[PDB]
Design a protein around this motif. Structure first.
Motif, PDB file in Angstrom:
ATOM      1  N   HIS A 105       5.588  10.432  -6.495  1.00 50.65           N
ATOM      2  CA  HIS A 105       4.428  10.710  -5.506  1.00 50.65           C
ATOM      3  C   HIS A 105       4.396  12.145  -5.109  1.00 50.65           C
ATOM      4  O   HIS A 105       4.393  12.550  -3.963  1.00 50.65           O
ATOM      5  CB  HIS A 105       4.510   9.821  -4.386  1.00 50.65           C
ATOM      6  N   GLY A 106       4.715  13.013  -6.266  1.00 55.17           N
ATOM      7  CA  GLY A 106       4.596  14.438  -5.793  1.00 55.17           C
ATOM      8  C   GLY A 106       5.842  15.115  -5.420  1.00 55.17           C
ATOM      9  O   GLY A 106       5.884  16.419  -4.958  1.00 55.17           O
ATOM     10  N   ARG A 146      -4.130  14.169  -0.700  1.00 55.34           N
ATOM     11  CA  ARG A 146      -2.513  13.929  -0.816  1.00 55.34           C
ATOM     12  C   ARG A 146      -2.386  12.406  -1.235  1.00 55.34           C
ATOM     13  O   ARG A 146      -2.976  11.408  -1.299  1.00 55.34           O
ATOM     14  CB  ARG A 146      -2.548  13.669   0.842  1.00 55.34           C
ATOM     15  N   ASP A 147      -1.355  12.447  -2.095  1.00 52.28           N
ATOM     16  CA  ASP A 147      -0.676  11.310  -2.585  1.00 52.28           C
ATOM     17  C   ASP A 147      -1.602  10.695  -3.532  1.00 52.28           C
ATOM     18  O   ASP A 147      -1.695   9.428  -3.566  1.00 52.28           O
ATOM     19  CB  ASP A 147      -0.010  10.397  -1.456  1.00 52.28           C
ATOM     20  N   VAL A 176      11.212  10.865  -1.262  1.00 53.68           N
ATOM     21  CA  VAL A 176      11.997  11.043   0.145  1.00 53.68           C
ATOM     22  C   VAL A 176      11.151  10.262   1.153  1.00 53.68           C
ATOM     23  O   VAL A 176      11.691   9.520   1.742  1.00 53.68           O
ATOM     24  CB  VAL A 176      12.297  12.396   0.443  1.00 53.68           C
ATOM     25  N   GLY A 177       9.704  10.183   1.039  1.00 54.16           N
ATOM     26  CA  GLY A 177       9.233   9.950   2.064  1.00 54.16           C
ATOM     27  C   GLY A 177       7.903   9.252   1.785  1.00 54.16           C
ATOM     28  O   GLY A 177       7.296   9.505   0.937  1.00 54.16           O
ATOM     29  N   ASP A 178       7.347   8.007   2.472  1.00 61.16           N
ATOM     30  CA  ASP A 178       5.998   7.441   2.181  1.00 61.16           C
ATOM     31  C   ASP A 178       4.982   8.284   3.117  1.00 61.16           C
ATOM     32  O   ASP A 178       4.895   8.091   4.431  1.00 61.16           O
ATOM     33  CB  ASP A 178       6.199   5.944   2.532  1.00 61.16           C
ATOM     34  N   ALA A 179       3.799   8.656   2.428  1.00 59.72           N
ATOM     35  CA  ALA A 179       2.824   9.455   3.082  1.00 59.72           C
ATOM     36  C   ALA A 179       1.854   8.338   3.721  1.00 59.72           C
ATOM     37  O   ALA A 179       1.214   8.862   4.520  1.00 59.72           O
ATOM     38  CB  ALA A 179       2.191  10.395   1.891  1.00 59.72           C
ATOM     39  N   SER A 180       1.998   7.297   3.095  1.00 64.47           N
ATOM     40  CA  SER A 180       0.958   6.170   3.270  1.00 64.47           C
ATOM     41  C   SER A 180       1.620   5.671   4.645  1.00 64.47           C
ATOM     42  O   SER A 180       0.662   4.865   5.179  1.00 64.47           O
ATOM     43  CB  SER A 180       0.988   5.120   2.190  1.00 64.47           C
ATOM     44  N   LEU A 181       2.750   5.698   5.058  1.00 62.36           N
ATOM     45  CA  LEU A 181       3.296   5.199   6.443  1.00 62.36           C
ATOM     46  C   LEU A 181       2.660   6.009   7.667  1.00 62.36           C
ATOM     47  O   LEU A 181       3.082   5.646   8.719  1.00 62.36           O
ATOM     48  CB  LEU A 181       4.721   4.878   6.256  1.00 62.36           C
ATOM     49  N   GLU A 182       1.856   7.046   7.376  1.00 68.52           N
ATOM     50  CA  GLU A 182       1.255   7.587   8.435  1.00 68.52           C
ATOM     51  C   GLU A 182      -0.248   7.184   8.562  1.00 68.52           C
ATOM     52  O   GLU A 182      -0.652   6.423   8.277  1.00 68.52           O
ATOM     53  CB  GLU A 182       1.499   9.119   8.166  1.00 68.52           C
TER      54      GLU A 182
END
Ligand SMILES: [Cl-]
Ligand SMILES: [Cl-]
Ligand SMILES: [Cl-]
Ligand SMILES: [Cl-]
Ligand SMILES: [Cl-]
Ligand SMILES: [Cl-]
Ligand SMILES: [Cl-]
Ligand SMILES: [Cu+2]
Length: 235
Positions: free
Chosen positions: A122-123, A69-70, A229-235
């Motif tokens: 970021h995809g 991912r990412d 739209v969203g930060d995958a890394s904030l999870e």
């Protein structure tokens, strides 16, 4: 070489969709044979257990990845366009059913291919969910990598346009049905060896002259973007 990890709805991650709400293939290899049954929804088209709930007007974001991912998303050599199609789920993608919601090829204003902007995003690329009848749909996201597309696959099977195809199961709940979905095109069948945008030489033909394969974007389509739209890394 790229796959869909999952989707976001109005900026909210729906979580890992692979083999859950995405009809994931077994790996990230492209489809290249334009007459293949694999053109519909890649090599493992079957009903998966979930369908993501949305309403008409929601922002639906597809998120791609290469290995994890990412990551690097897709090799930077893989310049080309991005399209999204919709079909009613009961079709299983068969027959004259695919309606184009989105196209982005080469942007003259900023001198970049859609794939190049996908990596920067970021995809992530999005569509607005259209005002079609409530029910179950397939959203078919398609990346065409053109770095070997000066040959037809039918003439040299080592080369050709590369299709990265991912079908997401989406359920539209609230909709006023103000734009009923019409018949569309078949996959396989809409793209042929003579279709504009399938055989293209990125090394000698200016990208300012590229025309993406028809069909044209449906009059009912509400738009989209290639943007994180969203930060995958904030999870
Ligand atoms: Cl979203
Ligand atoms: Cl479900
Ligand atoms: Cl790369
Ligand atoms: Cl569905
Ligand atoms: Cl509505
Ligand atoms: Cl129709
Ligand atoms: Cl168009
Ligand atoms: Cu590749």
């Amino acid at each position: 070489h790229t796959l869909v990890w999952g989707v976001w709805v109005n900026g909210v991650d729906q979580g890992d969709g692979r083999n859950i709400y995405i009809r994931s293939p077994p790996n990230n290899n492209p489809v290249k044979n334009l007459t293949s049954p694999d053109m519909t929804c890649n090599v493992d088209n079957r009903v998966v257990p979930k369908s993501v709930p949305v309403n008409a007007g929601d922002t639906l974001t597809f998120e791609w990845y290469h290995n994890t991912r990412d990551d690097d998303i897709i090799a930077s050599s893989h310049h080309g366009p991005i399209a999204v199609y919709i079909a009613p789920a009961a079709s299983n993608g068969q027959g004259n059913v695919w309606v184009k919601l989105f196209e982005d090829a080469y942007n003259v204003t900023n001198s970049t291919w859609a794939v190049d902007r996908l990596i920067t995003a970021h995809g992530q690329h999005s569509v607005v969910v259209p005002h079609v009848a409530p029910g179950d749909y397939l959203f078919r996201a398609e990346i065409i990598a053109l770095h070997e597309a000066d040959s037809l696959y039918s003439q040299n099977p080592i080369r050709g346009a590369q299709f990265y195809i991912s079908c997401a199961q989406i359920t539209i709940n609230s909709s006023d049905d103000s734009t009923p979905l019409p018949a569309g095109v078949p996959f396989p069948g809409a793209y042929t060896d003579s279709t504009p945008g399938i055989q293209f030489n990125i090394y000698t033909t200016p990208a300012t002259s590229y025309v993406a394969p028809p069909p044209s974007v449906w009059s009912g389509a509400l738009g989209g973007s290639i943007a994180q739209v969203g930060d995958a890394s904030l999870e």
